[PDB]
Amino acid sequence: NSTATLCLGHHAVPNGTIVKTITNDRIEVTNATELVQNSSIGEICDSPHQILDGENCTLIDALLGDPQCDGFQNKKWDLFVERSKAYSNCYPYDVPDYASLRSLVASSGTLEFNNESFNWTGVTQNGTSSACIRRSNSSFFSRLNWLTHLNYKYPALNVTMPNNEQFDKLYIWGVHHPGTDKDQIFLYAQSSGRITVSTKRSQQAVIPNIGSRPRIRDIPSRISIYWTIVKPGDILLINSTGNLIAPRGYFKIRSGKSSIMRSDAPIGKCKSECITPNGSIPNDKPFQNVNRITYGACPRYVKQSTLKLATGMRNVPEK
Amino acid sequence: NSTATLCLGHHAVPNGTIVKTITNDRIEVTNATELVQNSSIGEICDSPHQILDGENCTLIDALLGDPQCDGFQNKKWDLFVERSKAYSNCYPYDVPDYASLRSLVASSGTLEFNNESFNWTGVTQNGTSSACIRRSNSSFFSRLNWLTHLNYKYPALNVTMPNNEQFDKLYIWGVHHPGTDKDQIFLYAQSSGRITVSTKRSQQAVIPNIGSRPRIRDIPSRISIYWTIVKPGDILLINSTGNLIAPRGYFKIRSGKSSIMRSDAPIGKCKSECITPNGSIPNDKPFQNVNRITYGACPRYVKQSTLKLATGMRNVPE
Amino acid sequence: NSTATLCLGHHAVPNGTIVKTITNDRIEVTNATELVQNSSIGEICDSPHQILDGENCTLIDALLGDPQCDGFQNKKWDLFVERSKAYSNCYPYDVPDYASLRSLVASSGTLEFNNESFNWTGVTQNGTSSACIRRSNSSFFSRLNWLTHLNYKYPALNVTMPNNEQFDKLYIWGVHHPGTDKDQIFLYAQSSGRITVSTKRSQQAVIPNIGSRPRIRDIPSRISIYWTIVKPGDILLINSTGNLIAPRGYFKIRSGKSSIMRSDAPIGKCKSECITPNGSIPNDKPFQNVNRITYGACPRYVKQSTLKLATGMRNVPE
Amino acid sequence: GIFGAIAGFIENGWEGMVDGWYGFRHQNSEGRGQAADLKSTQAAIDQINGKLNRLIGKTNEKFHQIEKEFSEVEGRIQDLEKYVEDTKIDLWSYNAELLVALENQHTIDLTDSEMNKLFEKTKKQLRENAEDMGNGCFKIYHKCDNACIGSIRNGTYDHNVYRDEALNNRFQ
Amino acid sequence: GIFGAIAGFIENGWEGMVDGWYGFRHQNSEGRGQAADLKSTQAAIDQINGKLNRLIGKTNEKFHQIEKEFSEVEGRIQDLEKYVEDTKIDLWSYNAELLVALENQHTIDLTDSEMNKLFEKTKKQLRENAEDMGNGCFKIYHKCDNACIGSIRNGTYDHNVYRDEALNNRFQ
Amino acid sequence: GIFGAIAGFIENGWEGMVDGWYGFRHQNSEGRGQAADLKSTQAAIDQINGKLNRLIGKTNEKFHQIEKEFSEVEGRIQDLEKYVEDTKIDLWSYNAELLVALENQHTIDLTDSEMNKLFEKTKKQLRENAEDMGNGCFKIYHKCDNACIGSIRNGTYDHNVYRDEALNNRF
Ligand SMILES: *[C@@H]1O[C@H](CO)[C@@H](O[C@@H]2O[C@H](CO)[C@@H](O[C@@H]3O[C@H](CO[C@H]4O[C@H](CO)[C@@H](O)[C@H](O)[C@@H]4O)[C@@H](O)[C@H](O[C@H]4O[C@H](CO)[C@@H](O)[C@H](O)[C@@H]4O)[C@@H]3O)[C@H](O)[C@H]2NC(C)=O)[C@H](O)[C@H]1NC(C)=O
Ligand SMILES: *[C@@H]1O[C@H](CO)[C@@H](O[C@@H]2O[C@H](CO)[C@@H](O[C@@H]3O[C@H](CO[C@H]4O[C@H](CO)[C@@H](O)[C@H](O)[C@@H]4O)[C@@H](O)[C@H](O[C@H]4O[C@H](CO)[C@@H](O)[C@H](O)[C@@H]4O)[C@@H]3O)[C@H](O)[C@H]2NC(C)=O)[C@H](O)[C@H]1NC(C)=O
Ligand SMILES: *[C@@H]1O[C@H](CO)[C@@H](O[C@@H]2O[C@H](CO)[C@@H](O[C@@H]3O[C@H](CO)[C@@H](O)[C@H](O[C@H]4O[C@H](CO)[C@@H](O)[C@H](O)[C@@H]4O)[C@@H]3O)[C@H](O)[C@H]2NC(C)=O)[C@H](O)[C@H]1NC(C)=O
Ligand SMILES: *[C@@H]1O[C@H](CO)[C@@H](O[C@@H]2O[C@H](CO)[C@@H](O[C@@H]3O[C@H](CO)[C@@H](O)[C@H](O[C@H]4O[C@H](CO)[C@@H](O)[C@H](O)[C@@H]4O)[C@@H]3O)[C@H](O)[C@H]2NC(C)=O)[C@H](O)[C@H]1NC(C)=O
Ligand SMILES: *[C@@H]1O[C@H](CO)[C@@H](O[C@@H]2O[C@H](CO)[C@@H](O[C@@H]3O[C@H](CO[C@H]4O[C@H](CO)[C@@H](O)[C@H](O)[C@@H]4O)[C@@H](O)[C@H](O)[C@@H]3O)[C@H](O)[C@H]2NC(C)=O)[C@H](O)[C@H]1NC(C)=O
Ligand SMILES: *[C@@H]1O[C@H](CO)[C@@H](O[C@@H]2O[C@H](CO)[C@@H](O[C@@H]3O[C@H](CO[C@H]4O[C@H](CO)[C@@H](O)[C@H](O)[C@@H]4O)[C@@H](O)[C@H](O)[C@@H]3O)[C@H](O)[C@H]2NC(C)=O)[C@H](O)[C@H]1NC(C)=O
Ligand SMILES: *[C@@H]1O[C@H](CO)[C@@H](O[C@@H]2O[C@H](CO)[C@@H](O[C@@H]3O[C@H](CO)[C@@H](O)[C@H](O)[C@@H]3O)[C@H](O)[C@H]2NC(C)=O)[C@H](O)[C@H]1NC(C)=O
Ligand SMILES: *[C@@H]1O[C@H](CO)[C@@H](O[C@@H]2O[C@H](CO)[C@@H](O[C@@H]3O[C@H](CO)[C@@H](O)[C@H](O)[C@@H]3O)[C@H](O)[C@H]2NC(C)=O)[C@H](O)[C@H]1NC(C)=O
Ligand SMILES: *[C@@H]1O[C@H](CO)[C@@H](O)[C@H](O)[C@H]1NC(C)=O
Ligand SMILES: *[C@@H]1O[C@H](CO)[C@@H](O)[C@H](O)[C@H]1NC(C)=O
Ligand SMILES: *[C@@H]1O[C@H](CO)[C@@H](O)[C@H](O)[C@H]1NC(C)=O
Ligand SMILES: *[C@@H]1O[C@H](CO)[C@@H](O)[C@H](O)[C@H]1NC(C)=O
Ligand SMILES: *[C@@H]1O[C@H](CO)[C@@H](O)[C@H](O)[C@H]1NC(C)=O
Ligand SMILES: *[C@@H]1O[C@H](CO)[C@@H](O)[C@H](O)[C@H]1NC(C)=O
Ligand SMILES: *[C@@H]1O[C@H](CO)[C@@H](O)[C@H](O)[C@H]1NC(C)=O
Ligand SMILES: *[C@@H]1O[C@H](CO)[C@@H](O)[C@H](O)[C@H]1NC(C)=O
Ligand SMILES: *[C@@H]1O[C@H](CO)[C@@H](O)[C@H](O)[C@H]1NC(C)=O
Ligand SMILES: *[C@@H]1O[C@H](CO)[C@@H](O)[C@H](O)[C@H]1NC(C)=O
Ligand SMILES: *[C@@H]1O[C@H](CO)[C@@H](O)[C@H](O)[C@H]1NC(C)=O
């Protein structure tokens, strides 16, 4: 009369990992995976997204034509990376809605300038300044045109540029605010010069303010930058008497996956579809803790540094 | 025999339905229901929400007085529907913070104009242009008064009007921008002007800008529309040296369920709490995939085309 | 006999609590706890946070130096409380982006004014008004200097103030809009006086509008308040030909746990990590139903009034 | 399937089970038969209905909201409005998927509980007069006609009536 | 009720037990009495306390936020500021509602599970010395003095001592 | 612990069970030994893998979003941008936390289920030939070689051939 015994049981591991459930803060299980990406490789991968590095240039500076940003002319990008070392080496400028312009150009993702010939009759063209030094001579923004008086007479300007090529045009333009009255007569030969740039749907009027300003690159005058968008079938109308920083052409605006990100991480050679200011990160986890700023297919940002999901059963040790 | 058998079992159907679980993406259950709305009627319902159709008119144009929009005077709505075929046939106008005014009038839900009595002494009222063609001859925005020189003079205007009523009043006024200096001299007999609209708590000052602009209806000149809100115990003061397009009174404002929707869908006879630009949809399912724009009692918008909820046990065949 | 009965049972309470499950909307359980706070002591606690009441003084008035607000000078706060019984009697003033500046100073949580000596040569300082009665005598905003003509002439002002301190400076200045042109000539000896305050990264230019406005304390004129932030390593440049309400110094801006809240509730001496406009609430429960505006370690507001969590088993009584 | 009833010992479902969701299929000397248990069926149906009512019929009212579509590019304000709506849709989309997945898993498991509850009720009813083969069936070691099978289904089974015959047929 | 113990075969709860959540009620030759199982009670209480310690006491600090009450109707910015807060409130309210419903469901299930675990533990402890009546009670087919019930409740019951007597009372 | 098997009556984990998650450890004539059940183990991995597949799935692809870091202090519009991002971050962090807690609890219970299921299947197989002590072990009252253990492990076990021997041994 023999007997036998048959026990049923599960496996166990020496130490295991600790997770959290609905009922307990700490519980030991055999295996668990991490759901939060807590690290970055340290560099921004140049694939699969197109990366343009501004280095010493900002997006607006490359848009305007800073003498250190002529290499960004007619350049497209998927993500524009701005460094915390960029500076301006041109005429001091102030864009009243800077963030909106930067977002506009970033979402456009292209800096594509097609030049147009405006009938600037009676005004001296291609103005120059000692703050903007292209090559080794005084210059100005490449995409900007500075008009001064001809024969000490600045005539009225009435220039029309329609849009018939079936794509929206982004026009840059500016208004010069001289630091002295004497400067205003020296360049524009008028007391004060009004500016009116209009389309069939929008109008913009700018009046210049003449007065001293803090000197950057030994220039007390400033220039205000404005942007105008013209639809296909609409005409751009510029009507002025002076203090006009004229467009040299039209910038193209597109609708795409493009944006701009601020970082100081090197553009290393790899492929990662998620870019972060701290560097590119891998999209193998649902969540992440690197940065709240993301581009591409990116894990969602959470405040928690650690979040483990058990890939095994409760670990009951033999001991 | 001395033996019986009694088996316990469950039901099964050939019309299975695959649903989603935590641990499985494809599991077959007996019965299931749909949680997301995928199709619309396609047309907006007149019930229960009051629907006003602008057809060829926008909310701002009706608020301003474009002649084709003159039928919307004194009208109210629970939801204003703006069509793609909308167009303007009055003076070329521009409203800074246009979206703010549009939302403000929409949340108001009323276009109630009661005319007031400004003195406007020394100027000619009821200006007209060859674009705002009401009746058959020339007119202007029915809600706006255009002031020009009387006896070739434009005396300075300083008018007052108190808010002695317990409802906040909304005033629409404007500034005229002539295309030429010769124009500005012709209309107002003066070289440019100023306008200042003031309350005991807010002040707005506008400057006319003379310059050539793209001609709409052969009019190179423009007018800029602004709004002022005057509350009870306050006074509206208008101080103009010229180029003022004056209000003709006050619009009443309200707070309520009213809004505005942009749609090109027809208007039908039905009752539906949910109104969308694509059309009215039933609100029985908890979610929807028609449009992120909804009005009234509506299911919430989700990005997934279907969300099937199981109403039965797992379906195993025989 | 050789028979025994051993029953296994559970505990039941005479009167349980009804809770809600995903399956049953109403099921009875033994013990339950509330997860939503719907009550308050009706008081604001000055612990652990630093609470500063405003009484008759708004945050902007204390920043500017309203005579009744002089007790708020050089004071700090974690939370600033604004009461509906707030009145200003210095001078009628309008702040472009009033809300932004209010958030500016609130987030700073400090009003630390350090005085500086600008040139102000050729102009008369310490201008006074009869609406700003400080100490039974006409005065002005404490932190703002009113600049008048001297010897019936107003020289052009061009004043530079550098920031070498290792922190940021906040400047509050103003522009005067006289009600009549005779007032403008009487004060500033010039028909029109421009203002331009500029840094190396900003430029603010203002041209005043002369015009009568609704009178508060018999003052038909208005001063428009502007603020300029000068970062460490920048300069503040003031360029004027008249109509200047200049700063008497700089305000120190800081970052921290500071903010502002509106509440007509008393501040007794208690301790609560959570503050709401209805009065400090406890933070034991994870949710609250008192107000959406919260400050500190606060439960999260929800639409629901009461949510019950089962702290016991299902109740079946005998 | 946490008890292993629908996909466990009971390997197959019955399509002829059209009078209910859970049922009894007996074979005896009087032939076969198939009957329905309505307590288990309703104890399920009410549970999923209670879910359905928690989900279906609850609706919010949103009258005036932000603009969600745009025609001209503006800048920071338009991008902020787009971002707020995008984050709202995605968060509710997650809530919908997690709702469906959690409730469907519960639906399967609650039907698992009901089937196992029926098996336990029958097994405790039969006491020592029957044995389970692990396929959802019970071997009744005493002759049971249609009447006493209905006594099983109706709850009126006196195990003492047939205890001796079943025990003799089980151990001898 | 996924195990069918609280609302099932044990269809009556005892208000007389005040020293524990689960317990025993015995009838023997010495009379009748009641006791409580502190271990299973403690396990259920600990699980509930773990739920509370995950919920109660967790506070989030927010100091400076957007304005949520506006006195003058501004328009676009005011509408947007209203919309974000309304969206946040709605999403958090749904999170709260789903939380309490799920937690109450799991609480009921866990209490049912603890009761079922005690029943199966007693069943496996009694082995073939007793049988299940299907109402939560066990019929012991041998003489149990009060120390016998104590041995079942303390964990020191030896079935091999009463096995022969119980088998004779069972199958004879 | 809901079924009370992993932390319940089987309150011991075998670190020597490196082949599978659950299984059988036997002692009979011809000696003691240890083996694994492959169906129950695979069922547990399949459920966990289904959880993992549903977790990452498709990752949200966002390209141009609002600004989230600011150098200068601007006021209302910047506070609005910060508040929007805070609210989104906190809501997603809460979703993260609840998902981790609930799924981890579900994993604990699914593993306890598969154990109790395997135990129930083995009981139903042994019929009246064996008895349960209450520790995941069965006392078999018929001589079982290292062969009929495999029969129990693989479904090819007939209780009718050991029925009389086990009954006589039991009573
Ligand atoms: C807001 O509202 C106020 C109040 O109406 C306006 O202020 C008026 O401004 C005008 C023009 O600047 C002033 O008109 C001038 O009046 C002078 C005489 O005024 C006296 O007589 C009148 C009665 O006729 C009294 O009401 C007044 O109080 C004085 O006692 C004239 O001599 C001036 O003439 C000059 O201009 C005309 C017009 O081209 C020329 O023909 C003349 O040759 C000369 O150049 C002038 O007409 C008026 O007095 C002011 N009223 C006041 C101060 O109460 C604001 O202009 C208005 N807008 C703004 C932006 O503030
Ligand atoms: C453009 O048009 C507007 C119309 O709204 C004019 O604004 C009004 O201007 C008049 C004055 O011209 C204002 O009327 C005066 O109001 C004073 C208010 O004073 C307050 O404070 C004092 C104490 O400081 C209190 O005593 C008083 O009760 C008030 O609380 C009154 O004091 C004035 O009365 C005195 O003067 C008049 C005139 O001499 C005498 O008849 C009286 O008896 C008394 O001595 C006077 O009533 C009026 O309030 C203004 N309205 C608004 C809404 O502001 C602009 O002036 C005008 N602009 C021009 C023409 O350029
Ligand atoms: C900001 O600060 C700057 C610097 O102080 C200041 O620029 C100055 O502007 C004034 C006004 O335009 C200039 O002063 C004038 O200069 C001319 C030329 O020298 C003189 O003819 C003027 O004479 C006045 O007085 C005469 C006698 O009554 C009158 O007949 C004549 O019409 C004038 O009224 C007067 O002195 C000054 O030269 C400049 N400073 C420079 C160029 O360095 C500016 O005005 C300030 N404000 C603003 C808003 O910019
Ligand atoms: C937008 O552009 C328009 C022009 O298209 C401009 O409006 C004015 O247009 C006229 C012609 O259409 C410009 O020409 C003037 O014509 C008159 C004759 O009527 C001349 O007298 C003017 O100056 C001459 O004479 C002066 C005195 O002898 C001299 O000082 C001068 O050098 C000339 O010899 C002039 O030729 C006119 O100039 C413009 N207006 C102005 C202010 O220039 C309109 O102004 C433009 N937009 C804006 C916002 O100003
Ligand atoms: C209003 O007041 C302002 C007070 O600052 C005036 O601005 C100053 O104007 C003077 C001329 O009168 C300038 O002086 C020249 O500056 C250049 C620049 O070099 C200096 O700055 C660079 C900056 O990097 C620094 O590296 C150098 O070491 C110098 O310190 C000098 O090269 C010249 O020699 C000369 O000093 C001031 O630079 C200028 N300062 C500012 C901050 O603008 C303004 O002109 C007045 N407006 C009027 C009177 O209308
Ligand atoms: C904490 O303090 C808060 C502010 O004092 C309290 O808020 C109050 O809450 C009560 C109860 O919900 C509200 O009473 C109802 O309000 C609704 C809304 O109507 C208002 O809005 C519509 C918008 O279209 C407008 O048309 C109406 O005229 C109203 O202005 C009414 O329909 C009801 O009849 C009823 O009045 C208060 O309105 C509300 N006060 C506010 C928002 O100022 C809050 O209850 C306090 N919490 C506590 C004490 O626990
Ligand atoms: C400044 O440049 C603009 C653009 O070239 C000029 O606008 C054009 O002005 C002429 C009249 O001088 C307009 O012709 C008129 O058109 C109307 C409508 O078709 C027609 O009914 C009249 O009989 C006349 O032919 C022309 O349409 C207009 N073009 C545009 C695009 O607006 C403007 O005249 C120039 N000068 C000034 C002072 O603005
Ligand atoms: C313009 O008005 C300001 C503000 O009232 C004047 O500054 C103030 O000047 C007084 C003295 O006239 C200062 O009070 C005294 O300060 C000294 C030194 O600390 C102390 O020993 C005395 O006991 C008394 O407290 C007062 O602090 C000062 N306020 C400031 C600087 O904010 C200014 O003098 C006036 N200028 C002119 C030209 O009238
Ligand atoms: C200014 O530069 C452009 C560049 O193409 C040229 O076309 C134009 O003739 C120049 N104008 C001058 C030199 O006056
Ligand atoms: C990423 O960088 C930000 C600052 O740009 C920092 O606050 C954050 O802690 C970093 N996250 C890391 C290193 O994971
Ligand atoms: C609206 O305009 C269309 C032309 O676009 C016209 O056919 C229709 O009759 C108009 N409806 C009105 C004016 O009610
Ligand atoms: C203003 O209008 C009122 C209307 O009754 C009139 O009595 C008064 O004389 C008017 N004032 C002027 C200055 O025309
Ligand atoms: C201007 O139109 C209004 C409209 O009600 C009318 O009362 C007034 O008499 C008109 N003025 C004229 C025609 O001069
Ligand atoms: C229910 O639980 C709470 C937890 O704080 C406790 O204070 C209360 O006494 C309990 N009620 C009962 C009846 O056990
Ligand atoms: C506020 O004003 C009231 C009168 O309106 C006065 O009684 C009270 O003392 C004032 N409080 C302060 C702090 O000035
Ligand atoms: C500023 O003050 C200095 C010193 O008193 C003086 O020399 C200079 O002229 C002043 N600047 C002016 C008056 O613009
Ligand atoms: C303050 O006001 C009183 C009013 O009675 C006046 O007499 C006194 O002169 C004023 N103070 C000074 C310093 O003048
Ligand atoms: C058993 O119950 C059924 C209803 O479920 C009834 O039709 C039948 O007559 C009953 N039979 C007995 C024997 O109780
Ligand atoms: C078992 O019950 C008996 C009752 O006589 C008691 O003496 C003993 O202490 C109990 N066991 C334990 C471990 O307490």
Numbering used by the authors:
A (entry chain B): 8 to 326
B (entry chain C), C (entry chain A): 8 to 325
D (entry chain c), E (entry chain a): 330 to 501
F (entry chain b): 330 to 500
Excerpt from the publication:
Neutralizing antibodies target the hemagglutinin (HA), a trimeric protein containing “stem” (also known as the “stalk”) and “head” domains in each protomer. Other designs, such as centralized conserved and computationally optimized broadly reactive antigen (COBRA) HA proteins, retain the subtype-specific structural architecture in both domains while seeking to accentuate the conserved features common to circulating strains.
Through structural comparisons with other HA proteins, including novel crystal structures of COBRA HAs TJ2 and J4, we identified the residues primarily responsible for the variable binding patterns observed by biolayer interferometry. To investigate the molecular factors that may improve or worsen the recognition of HA by these antibodies, we performed structural comparisons of the NG2-Fab cryo-EM structures with representative HA proteins from the BLI assay panel. This included newly solved crystal structures of TJ2 and J4 as representative strong binders, as well as a previously solved structure of the A/Port Chalmers/1/1973 HA and an AlphaFold3 prediction of the A/Tasmania/503/2020 HA to represent no binding and weak binding, respectively. In TJ2, the presence of an asparagine at residue 145 rather than a serine creates the potential for a new hydrogen bond with R73 by virtue of the shorter intermolecular distance. The COBRA HA J4, while lacking this same feature, shows some evidence in the electron density map of an N-linked glycan at residue 144. Given the proximity, this may allow for additional interactions between the HA and the antibody via polar contacts. Even the difference in the absence or presence of an additional hydroxyl group, as seen with F159 in COBRA HA TJ2 versus Y159 in COBRA HA J4, is enough to alter the kinetics in binding via a faster dissociation rate.
